[PDB]
Structures are given as C-alpha cells and as structure tokens.
C-alpha cells in the first residue's frame, strides 16, 4: 500500500513548465482537439450531460522534433488538472506482477484525484504488437493496460490518457483502438517556421525585419522545430565569436548558422508516417 | 535507490588524465566547440542569460584512432566539472528493469552535482534504431535515455552529454536529434602530423631539426594519430636494439619505422563517413 | 564480486608448460618482438621511463598449424609474469549483460597482478566486423573489449594482450587498430624444417646424419609444423610394428611415414594471408 | 479472502439486451446458458446438463466485453470479473491458493458467472515461461475447470480474447462453445446510430440513419460510438466559432474518422474459425 | 560401459581394427612402451557412407577398452541460450580429464563443424572455436583422452579440425567374407536348414549392401514364417532371396566419388 504510494509520490509533478498555447507555433487542429478535451470539460461542466461525453484518449504521432512533448507541456500548464507523467522506468518492477499492480494503482490514484491527465511518453516501448514479445512484460503489462483503460469494472470517467510516439505502426491494434483520436503532428510549413524564428529570437536586439524572418523561413524547408531551435541557439552565439576575435544580431549571423546546421529528419521516415496517417489517422494541420 | 548509486559511484572518474589543450594536434574546430560549451559557461556565467543558452550535447564521430577519446581526456583535465564516464557495461543489468533505474539515477547524480559532464563512450552500442532489437534492453534503455535527456519533467540544465562513435549511421534518429552538434573528427593533415611528431618525441635527445619533422610529416600521408604514436614508439626503441647489436636518433630510424609500420584505415569506410558528414554533420577542421 | 572471481579463478594457469625458446624453430622476428615486449620490461625496468613505453598488444596470425599457440606456450614458460589464457568459454554468459562484467572483471583482475599477459586465443570468434552480427553479443562484447583496452579511465599499464587468429581479414577495424603489431607467422622454410626433424626425434637412437635430416627437409616442402610432428610420430611407431609384425631407425622409416601421411593446407588460403600481410602486417621471419 | 473479494463488482452497468445491435446467436447461447437454468431448474436433470464454458472471440472492438456487461446486468448472479493482476503473486504457493479460493467463493455464491477476461495473459503455452507464474496457475486452473458433474449451479466461465490462435489447446478444449463476434453489417449499424444519438434533438429521418449505415462499411461498434461522439460535439463548434443536428455533422465526422481493423487480422480470425470455431 | 560387443564381433577392414587396437589397447595393456618421444595417438576420424558400422566399432572400443566412454553426439550439444553449447563441451572435457584414460566419441562431427564460410556468428565460431582450443590449446592437457568422431560428409569439415584429427581412416563398402559372416551372426541360434554354401550364396548375392541392410534382410526373413502362420514353418534360402529382392539400399555411385576424392587428398 504505502510502500507503493511512496514509490509513486514522485510522479505527481509540481512545477508547471511555463509553455503557453502561443509558445506553440503552428498546429491549429491539435491545439483545438486538446482544448476541447482538456480545458472545456472543466470550464463548462454543465454541457457534458446525457450522450455528450468528453474524449478519453488522444495519441500524438509524427516525425522526431515537431512538437509532441512540447504541446504536452502546454497542456501541463494550461489544464488545471493533476498531470501524471509516467514512463517505463516507473512501471517495470522486479517482483512478480508489480508491473500490473503498479499500473492498477496508477489509475486508482488518477481516479481519486479526478480530473486527471496521464501522459505516457513514448508508448511504443510498452506496447509492442505482441507477436514476438516475452510472456511477462508483454502479455501482462500490455494486458493490464488494456483492461485498465476500458475493461468491465473500471470506470474511465474523467481521466484522459495522452501519449506520444515516433513509430506509430509498431503499436498493437487493441491499443490503437483505445486511443480514439490519433492526431498527426507534421513538419512545419512556411508560416510556422517564420513564427518559430520570431519566437526563438525572443527579446534579443536584432536588426532583422519581417522580410528577413520571411527569408529564413523560405530558406529552411525540411527542418523540424528542434532544428530551428538550434539554429537560433547557434546564431545567438555569433556575437561572442565576434567579441573574442577582436554587438547586434545581423543577418549574416543567421545565414552563417543556416549554412552550418543541417536537417535532422530524412525522407523515407516521412513515407511511413504518411502511410499511417492515410490508413488510420487525423491531420494536425 | 542507494543500491544503484552504490553501483554507479565507480563511474565518476577522479584521476584527471593529464592531457592539456596543447597536446592535441589539429582539430581547431572541435576544441573550439568544446571550449565554448564547457569552459566558457563556468568562467563567465553572467553572459549566458536570456535566450543565450549553452550547448547540451556533442557527438564526436570519425574513423578509428583519430582523437575522439583523447579529446575527451582533454576535457576531463581542463573542465573543472564532475566528469562522469559511463559505458554500456555499467547500465545493463540482470534483474528486469534494473537496467533503466540505472539510467535514471545516473542522470539524477549529474543533476545533484551540476555543472556535470556525462561521457558516453561508443553510443551506438546502447542506441540501435529499435526496429529489430529486444524488448527490455532495446526499448527500455534507449527509451529511458531519450526521455531522460530532454523529456517533460526533467530539466537538462547545466549537464552536458558527450558521446563518441565509429558507426554514426546506425544511430536512432531521435538520438541523432538529441545530440545537437554532431562534429566530425577526420584523419590528420600536414601541420597536424608535424605537430604530433614534435609532441611524441617529447624531451628525448635528438639531432632532428624543423625540416626533419617537416620531412617526416610530408612522408606519412594516410596515417592516423595512433600510427604516428607507434612509429615514434618503435623509433625510440631503435637505439636499444643497436645496443643489442653491438645513441641519439637518425632520421633513418624514423624512415625505418615508417617502412615497417602500416596504417589502419582503408578507403570505403571514408565514403560512408563523408556520406554522414554531407547529410547531417559539421566539419572538425 | 566473488561470484565472478569464483568463475575466473580457473584461468590463472599454474603448471608452466615446459616449452623453451630453443624448441620453437625459425621465426626470429616474432621471438624478437615478443622478447622486447615481455622479457625486457621486467628485466630492465629503469629503461622504460619518459616517452619510452612498452608495447601493449600483439596479434599473431597465419595459416593453421604453424606455431602461434605454441609460441604462446613459450612465452608462458619464459615470461615470469601472471598469464591468463582466457577463451570464449569463459566470457559468454546467459543472463543479459553478465558477459561484459567478466571482460571488465578480467582486466580489473589483471591490474592487481601487474605485470600480466592476457592470451585471447582465436580472437576472430569474439570480434566479427559487426555488419551482420547480433545486438548483444556483437555490440556489447566487442564494445567492452574496445573501451577496456584503451578507453578513458582505464590505464592499460603493464598488461599485454596477445591474440592469435587464422582469419585475420574478418577482424573489426577498431580491433585491428588496438593490436599494434600484427606479426605474420608463415609456413616454415628449409632450415626450419630440418630443425624440426632434429628436435622431434629427440634423444631416440637413430643412424641418421646431418645430410639425412637435410634430405628430409628438402623432401617436405609444403608441410607445416604439425605435419612434421606427425611424420615423426609415425616414423617412431614403425619399430613397434616391427615387433608385432614378427629395432633401429633408418631413413626408410621416415620415407614410409611421409608416403602415408598427407598434408592439411591449401594454396589459396595463402593468397588471402599474403594479402593481409601486404596491406596491414609485419613479417615474422 | 479479503484480497480476491475485489473481484465482485456491485455497480451493475446498465446495459440491457436491447442495446447490443445484432449478435442474435450469441444472445441465444448466453440466454440458454445463463437465464434458463435459473428460471426453469427442473429441466436440467438426468443427462441434460448446462454448459460450463463459453469463449467469445473476434476482432478488436466488436462487442465482447460489452456483451459481458449485458450479462452482468441481466443475469441476477454473482459476478467475478477477475484478471491476471489479481491472481499472480511473489510468494510461491500463492498462485495455487488464489485460484482455489476463487472457485470456492464462487461456490459460496451460487449461481456464479466468472469472467476471466483476456485468458491469453494467464495461459501462455508453458515452453518459455517462468516457474511460479506460468505452471502452477495453469495446471490448477485446468483441474478446477475439470469440474464437470459437480458444477451444475454456479460456475459458468466466460472469456473474451482478440488473439484466439495463441491459446493453449487444453484450454481451447475447456471452452466448449467458441463463438465468433464479427464486424457488424447493415441493420446493426443503423441500429447503433439510432441508439447512440439517444434522445438528442435531430432533424434526421429513418432514411438518414439508413444512409449513414450504408456509408460506414468496415466499422466496428467502437468507431460508430466515436463518430456519434464527434458529431455530437459539432454544435459546440458551431457556438464557439461565432443548434440542431444535421446530416452534414455526421458526414463531417465520417470524413474525419478512419477505421480501426486491418484486413489481414481478419484472415487469421477466419483461419481460427475455420479450424476450431 | 561394457555390454558384450567385441573385436570378434565385427566383419572386415582389419586396418581400422588394428589402428584402434593399437591406439587404445597398446597403451592400456602396456603403459611402459610409451616413454620419451613415443606418444600415443590422440584423435582419429572415421568416416564413410552410412550403414558401414562406424558407431558399432566405436562401442566395440567402449567394451573392449577398459576405458570410460562418453557417447555424446551433435544432437545433445546444440542449444539456443547464448554460450550454453560451450560449457557442455568444457565440462565434458573436465570429466574426461579427471578420469584418465577416457574416450570421447562425437558422433556426426559434421554437424558441429561446417567449414565456416556461410555459418552464423555464434554457433559457427563459438562451438568450432571451443572445440579447437579444447582439443589442444594452451592450458588444457589432452593426456589420456582420445577424441573419436564419425562423419558422412568429410569434405564439409573445417581445415583446422581436419588438422586436429590426425588419422583420417576411411571405412568402405564391404567385401564377401564379411557379408557371409554377418548372415551367420544375424541368424543367431535360430533353427535353419542352411549350409555354408547357402550363406556363401547369399553373400555372393548381396553386393552393395551395408551391415544395416543385411541386419534388416535377416529381420524380414525371420518374420516370413510367422507371417505365413497367422495370416493363414521353417527358414529357407528362398526366404532370404525374397527379403533381399524386397529390401533396397541407400547409396548412390557419385557419393563414392567425393568420398574417394577426400581419401585421395587427405585420408
């Protein structure tokens, strides 16, 4: 009992990472679904009565570095709900069915503290299609996650289960069933990239104009949001290099950084992402 | 908890291998990036405020024997930090999900003793693209390394994660994303080879001049730094051998050694290295 | 700890196989390198100070049956140092990363007993070029052998790592790098064959002269040292067959044995051996 | 005792037999194995014994656990919804007494129906499994499911699964009516739209529900429950952005929502049905 | 382990019989002729086509040895658990070192040792390598053990292991006197009207048969009269001719070309 709550006391996070819905760039559709599944039931609870029930599972997928965990931080700031962030380190115990007793205790805590959010980051490492896996970890952790999410005597009222992944095709079909809105988070388009440069330079003194950010956003097709965060990181180091080899941010610093920094995602990973989106998925816009 | 920190207490190295920034030859770019990611945040911490954050991951790759682990020893001498040095022997365990509370409490050790450095030597043996690997080792050690490096509730402030590899194309794309400056350590060039002969002869009495070292450096195109360390080893063991067949050093001693000693690298390995550098990488100069 | 030392207690050999340097015929280069890497640091330790360090890895290769393991027995008799004759039976175990702790525990034992010699016989069965191998055995045993041989916090002082192989082209290039003197042990020439007949007849009463052994050595071109050990075995077993089939040794006994006994090796294996010697190797003389 | 009596539920999820759409053979077998022994107990005397094991199988999301909830409402039994979390233990010789206790309290509470949901997680062919959990559980369970003549009141062992081909052949033997719950056809889909809109004010007619049911071939009952969920959200989009239910709301939802089962999973389901079912 | 099997029991090929009587009996009956440079043989590879009495000759050495005998084989050393197929080998040689003299009979060595150009990493390199190092090696002391081994595919054997087996003897298809002896043995003490010229006739009739085939024509010919009992006597030569017409051997006359190839190159 209390030994186990002594273990899982270190999962109720208590610091509210200050990412707001405008610190996310792009993604109208994913913010829209997440708002009407997280913000709106709490703010107007009289609406959800009768047949109109809130959503109880949302899967975000995409290529690496495009906004999934970050949008989860935005939910963690704006939700006003208890935000459990669990992972595979915290469920696999050593001891014959604690990896089922821990899961069952997790959702029991998230029912006694409703409204709650459970964010299982990289769900593809728990849930691996069960055709090659081992007996215990495979059948018993996957099976207790299944039965615990909808089941018979279980009552998934007021809990939401997020989840992010990069390999959405290696996911078991029963767990593809449980996540009832598979939203796809793509590489950013032109307006999103321009927005991310304008955000990531912050309040740093620069001589750049709107057509300069527009120029860079035109220059960077193929980059995810991580890559643009690191070209802004490197370009913000350029005044120090000046001030040792001897100020303002001036556009040759950014052109210097963009010449040096190279994309991170290739172009067949995108084919299997588009495959899954065309066979099972939403479109995150 | 403390059982696991009792295991990983023997990874924080404490003997400080006395290699200084002089003792590396060539590689101005890699020393430059490592200095402005390790030395400079500590020495002038007032600068790095606002949007200007230090680098939190550097991958060094290259052919075998060109300077990677040695440059890590140079960081270990010059850094003034709590240099850990961990490897795959020290993270994988026997009892079912102990092999990732090790990963977690490694990074929690580096957070309790910041500013810290984590040097994961040969990272392609932990992190193997997870499409063919086994459940426990693969998904759970790779996944806890991912979530622990950036994640949601994790705060990678003030830790730096190094890493070296020889097979940089067999690395998972999420972990290619986490290492945000992939620097390439190449085979040497003329001035570097001349510098390595001048270093490796040390303070040994020799009749050689600058044009002699210049001659040998012109003679040895294709050799890595290991090979020049062993031709200096053999040439320093020539006069003992003449004591046995019966002095200072002739250039015929070095020509003798260079005739006998034969390089390590070949010339299609270089094609795949140049491939990765042209698709994702920096240039170590 | 003590479970693992209970495993590796059966590697410190304790019987000193009485093979002396005179018994090993031919091959003065390989004896020369092995003496100046094994005998000479112990006998005159004042010499090796400053930049002059002893050799810390020697690979012997060749065709099957030419002297490699035997020369290792000669080192094991003449060395006066702690000798571990480890093999693949003593490094692989079943329990998920308990093989690596035997490798690490082997070198961590060897630096308690310094000076030491580690003789890994048939290193081509541990180290298999890692392009087709499996995840665990491949990346983790090869990787722990690499990092453990030179690494960062590891200090290969006073240990020597021998190693023999018959397939030297199937060896990983990082481990070709670690073995810093690849010596080649070839098929014997005329004087060596004559020496091997004179040794293997021992002190057995024979009517043979120097021109008789010279005759047989001229007769046997193509034979390795195994084959000449078995023609001397069979020729010594002729007289017992002249007691059952019904004395003294005359050259018809050896001609009888050489007619009956047929060789082992094949003349394209030698082409790939000479290939590797011309691309990466020393010459064992 | 007080560790397995968290298998008895008591809240009675109010699903009645006129909420599952279609599946008439399955309702027929479940009625003549659950309702009929209690209502006319004089009939089952002599050679005529009730059924003592029923396996439901099918693709994911087609009605298995839901039909088990319907039994849990309509049965008037005592209902143990046990699972693998509640039977396995660290201490050796606890995964013997736990199963044994389960069936003994089922005979405390006759009539009993016991719903071992997802039986492939208890019973895993025992060639690779660990000593404690796999062997003594599956052998003790085989014994206690060999109560043929004594279990004439009480235990009816249901069970649902999605992977019916990964089931041990002795346990395929114990479940003596393997019924297959398939993806639903036209009248069932039309019925599910009419149920899931509930009493919500809509302008739709019978030919509108008939139209949508014609539109959705390939969907299971989960998918139609979520297109009705999303289409019922559509008014609040027309209030936030800045009303009645239209048919453009449902066409909007059906464009956005994409099916769940893949058409090779059905090949292995049909395989097992043709070989054992 | 000594049930009956004898040097008297076997038919033909006294070269094999004398090489082995030498390599086991000549040290054991006399351990004082082998001193100095004169050491006994420590490995013998028998081969041949099937049916030719290899493993039976091995168990003749088991009875006729006064030595321990471990009849392990390739079926019993395959595993699939990461270095279990080596500790079996090593502990086998541990009980053979502790129990001098010993004989290790590895039946069908061609299933362990498969030329290593196409094989997999672990099983190829690790079972072959532990067999190599364990047979002579450095700290290993192959005193008093003899490693036998039989095979039907002797050309698919690795050249280092062809080197370790230092007397590759070839067991061929047998002659006339051996076949006549095998009929006389296999009829046992069963009442038959046959004479020496009858067994001589059958032995002339059966050229191409191995010892298995003659054991089964004697099996079938012994079950002819009971067959005429219960689906309705004595033992005639027409019973054996009947059986030999019905029963057919295994072999092909190009398999013999590759056997003779290996014998002419290494054997």
């Amino acid at each position: 009992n209390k030994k186990l709550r002594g273990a899982l006391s270190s999962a109720i996070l208590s610091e509210k990472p200050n990412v707001k819905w405008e610190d996310v760039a792009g993604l109208e559709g994913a913010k829209e679904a997440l708002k009407e599944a997280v913000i709106l039931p709490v703010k107007f609870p009289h609406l959800f009565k009768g047949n109109r029930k809130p959503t109880s599972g949302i899967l975000l997928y995409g290529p690496p570095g495009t906004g999934k965990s970050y949008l989860a931080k935005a939910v963690a700031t704006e939700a006003n709900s208890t935000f459990f962030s669990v992972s595979s380190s915290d469920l696999v115990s050593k001891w014959m069915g604690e990896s089922e007793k821990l899961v069952k205790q997790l959702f029991a805590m998230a029912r006694e503290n409703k409204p709650s959010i459970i964010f299982i980051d990289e769900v593809d490492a728990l849930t691996g299609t069960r055709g090659e896996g081992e007996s215990e970890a495979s059948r018993r952790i996957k099976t207790e996650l299944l039965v615990q999410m909808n089941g018979v005597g279980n009552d998934s009222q007021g809990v939401l289960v997020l989840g992010a992944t990069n390999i959405p095709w290696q996911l078991d079909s029963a767990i593809r069933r449980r996540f009832e809105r598979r939203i796809y988070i793509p590489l950013p388009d032109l307006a999103a990239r321009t927005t991310m440069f304008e955000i990531n330079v912050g309040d740093t003194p620069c001589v750049l104009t709107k057509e300069d950010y527009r120029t860079l956003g035109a220059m960077t097709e193929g980059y995810s949001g991580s890559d643009i965060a690191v070209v802004v990181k490197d370009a913000l180091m350029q005044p120090i290099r000046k001030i040792q080899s001897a100020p303002d941010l001036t556009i040759k610093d950014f052109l210097k950084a963009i010449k040096s920094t190279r994309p991170t995602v290739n172009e067949d990973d995108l084919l299997k992402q588009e495959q899954f989106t065309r066979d099972f998925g939403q479109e995150g816009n | 908890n403390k059982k696991l920190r009792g295991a990983l207490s023997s990874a924080i190295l404490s003997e400080k291998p006395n290699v200084k920034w002089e003792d590396v030859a060539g590689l101005e770019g890699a020393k430059e990036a490592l200095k402005e990611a390790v030395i400079l945040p500590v020495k002038f911490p007032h600068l790095f405020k606002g949007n200007r954050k230090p680098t939190s991951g550097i991958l060094l790759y290259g052919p075998p024997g060109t300077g990677k682990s040695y440059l890590a020893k140079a960081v270990a001498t010059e850094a003034n930090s709590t240099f850990f040095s961990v490897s795959s022997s020290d993270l994988v365990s026997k009892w079912m999900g102990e092999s990732e509370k090790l990963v977690k409490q490694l990074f929690a050790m580096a957070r309790e003793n910041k500013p810290s450095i984590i040097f994961i030597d040969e990272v392609d043996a932990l992190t193997g693209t997870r499409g063919e690997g086994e459940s426990e080792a693969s998904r759970r050690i790779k996944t806890e390394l991912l979530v622990q490096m950036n994640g949601v509730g994790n705060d990678s402030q003030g830790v730096l994660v190094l890493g070296a590899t020889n097979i940089p194309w067999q690395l998972d794309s999420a972990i290619r994303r986490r290492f945000e400056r992939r620097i390439y350590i190449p085979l040497p060039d003329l001035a570097a080879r001349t510098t390595m002969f001048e270093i490796n002869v040390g303070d040994t009495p020799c009749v050689l001049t600058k044009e002699d070292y210049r001659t040998l450096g012109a003679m040895t195109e294709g050799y890595s730094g290991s090979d020049i360390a062993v031709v200096v080893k053999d040439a320093l063991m020539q006069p003992i051998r003449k004591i046995q067949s019966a002095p200072d050093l002739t250039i015929k001693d070095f020509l003798k050694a260079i005739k006998s000693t034969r390089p390590t690298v070949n010339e299609d390995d270089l094609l795949k290295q140049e491939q990765f550098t042209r698709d994702f990488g920096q240039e170590g100069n | 700890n003590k479970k693992l030392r209970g495993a590796l207690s059966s590697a410190i050999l304790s019987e000193k196989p009485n093979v002396k340097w005179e018994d090993v015929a031919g091959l003065e280069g390989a004896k020369e390198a092995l003496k100046e890497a094994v005998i000479l640091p112990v006998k005159f330790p004042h010499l090796f100070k400053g930049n002059r360090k002893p050799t810390s890895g020697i690979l012997l290769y060749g065709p099957p049956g030419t002297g490699k393991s035997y020369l290792a027995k000669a080192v094991a008799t003449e060395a006066n140092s702690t000798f571990f004759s480890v093999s693949s039976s003593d490094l692989v175990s079943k329990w998920m990363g308990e093989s690596e702790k035997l490798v690490k525990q082997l070198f961590a034992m060897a630096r308690e007993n310094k000076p030491s010699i580690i003789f890994i016989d048939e290193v081509d069965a541990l180290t298999g070029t890692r392009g087709e191998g499996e995840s665990e055995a491949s990346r983790r045993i090869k990787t722990e052998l690499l990092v453990q041989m030179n690494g960062v916090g590891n200090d290969s002082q006073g240990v020597l790592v021998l190693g023999a192989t018959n397939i030297p082209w199937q060896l990983d290039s990082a481990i070709r790098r670690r073995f810093e003197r690849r010596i080649y042990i070839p098929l014997p020439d005329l004087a060596a064959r004559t020496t091997m007949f004179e040794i293997n007849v021992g002190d057995t009463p024979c009517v043979l002269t120097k021109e008789d052994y010279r005759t047989l050595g001229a007769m046997t071109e193509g034979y390795s040292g195994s084959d000449i050990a078995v023609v001397v075995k069979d020729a010594l077993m002729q007289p017992i067959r002249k007691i059952q089939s019904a004395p003294d040794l005359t050259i018809k006994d050896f001609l009888k044995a050489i007619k009956s006994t047929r060789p082992t090796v094949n003349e394209d294996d030698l082409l790939k051996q000479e290939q590797f010697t011309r691309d990466f190797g020393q010459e064992g003389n | 005792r007080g560790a397995l009596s968290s298998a008895i539920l008591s809240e009675k999820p109010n699903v009645k037999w006129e909420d599952v759409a279609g599946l008439e053979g399955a309702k027929e077998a479940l009625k003549e194995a659950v309702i009929l022994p209690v209502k006319f107990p004089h009939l089952f005397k002599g050679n005529r014994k009730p059924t003592s094991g029923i396996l439901l199988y099918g693709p994911p999301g087609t009605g298995k656990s839901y039909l088990a909830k319907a039994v849990a409402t309509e049965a008037n039994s005592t209902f143990f919804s046990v699972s693998s979390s509640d039977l396995v233990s660290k201490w050796m010789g606890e995964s013997e007494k736990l199963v044994k206790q389960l069936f003994a309290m089922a005979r405390e509470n006759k009539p009993s129906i016991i719903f071992i949901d997802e039986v492939d997680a208890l019973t895993g062919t025992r060639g690779e499994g660990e000593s404690e959990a796999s062997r003594r559980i599956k052998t003790e369970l085989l014994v206690q499911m060999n109560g043929v003549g004594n279990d004439s009141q009480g235990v009816l062992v249901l069970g649902a699964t999605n992977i019916p081909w990964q089931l041990d052949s002795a346990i395929r033997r114990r479940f003596e009516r393997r019924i297959y719950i398939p993806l639903p056809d036209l009248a069932a889909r039309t019925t599910m739209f009419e149920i899931n809109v509930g009493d919500t004010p809509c302008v739709l007619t019978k030919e509108d529900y008939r139209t949508l049911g014609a539109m959705t071939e390939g969907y299971s009952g989960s998918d139609i429950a979520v297109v009705v969920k999303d289409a019922l959200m559509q008014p609040i989009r027309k209030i936030q952005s800045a009303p009645d239910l239209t048919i453009k709301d449902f066409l909007k939802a059906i464009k956005s929502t994409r099916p769940t089962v893949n058409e090779d999973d059905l090949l292995k389901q049909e395989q097992f049905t043709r070989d054992f079912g | 382990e000594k049930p009956n099997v004898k040097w008297e029991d076997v038919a033909g090929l006294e070269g094999a019989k004398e090489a082995l009587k030498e390599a086991v009996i000549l040290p054991v009956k006399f351990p004082h002729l082998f001193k100095g440079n004169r050491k006994p043989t420590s490995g013998i590879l028998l081969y041949g086509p099937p049916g030719t009495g290899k493993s039976y000759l091995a168990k003749a050495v088991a009875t006729e040895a006064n030595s321990t005998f471990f009849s392990v084989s390739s079926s019993d050393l395959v595993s699939k658990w990461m270095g279990e197929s080596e500790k079996l080998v090593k502990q086998l040689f541990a009980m053979a070192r502790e129990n001098k003299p010993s004989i290790i009979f590895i039946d069908e060595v061609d299933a362990l040792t498969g030329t290593r150009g196409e094989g997999e990493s672990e099983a190829s390199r690790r079972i072959k390598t532990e067999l190599l190092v364990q047979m002579n090696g450095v700290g290993n002391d192959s005193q008093g053990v003899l490693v036998l081994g039989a095979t039907n595919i002797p050309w698919q054997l690795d050249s280092a292991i062809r080197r370790r087996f230092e007397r590759r003897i070839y067991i061929p298809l047998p002659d006339l006197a051996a076949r006549t002896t095998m009929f006389e043995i296999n009829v046992g003490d069963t009442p038959c009207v046959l004479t020496k010229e009858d067994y001589r006739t059958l032995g002339a009739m059966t050229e191409g048969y191995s010892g298995s085939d003659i054991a089964v024509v004697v099996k079938d010919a012994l079950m002819q009269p009971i067959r005429k009992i219960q689906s309705a006597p004595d033992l005639t030569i027409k019973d054996f001719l009947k059986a030999i017409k019905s029963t057919r051997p295994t072999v092909n006359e190009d398999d013999l070309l590759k056997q003779e190839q290996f014998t002419r190159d290494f054997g």
């Binding site: 050593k94 001891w95 014959m96 215990e136 | 026997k94 009892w95 079912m96 426990e136 | 079943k94 329990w95 998920m96 665990e136 | 660290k90 201490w91 050796m92 660990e130 000593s131 404690e132 | 658990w81 990461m82």
Partner: peptide, 8 residues
Amino acid sequence: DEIVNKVL
C-alpha cells in the same frame, strides 16, 4: 520472494 531474472 521469487524474483524474476532475465535471459538472452
């Protein structure tokens, strides 16, 4: 208590 190990 009967703990689980893990194999290769």
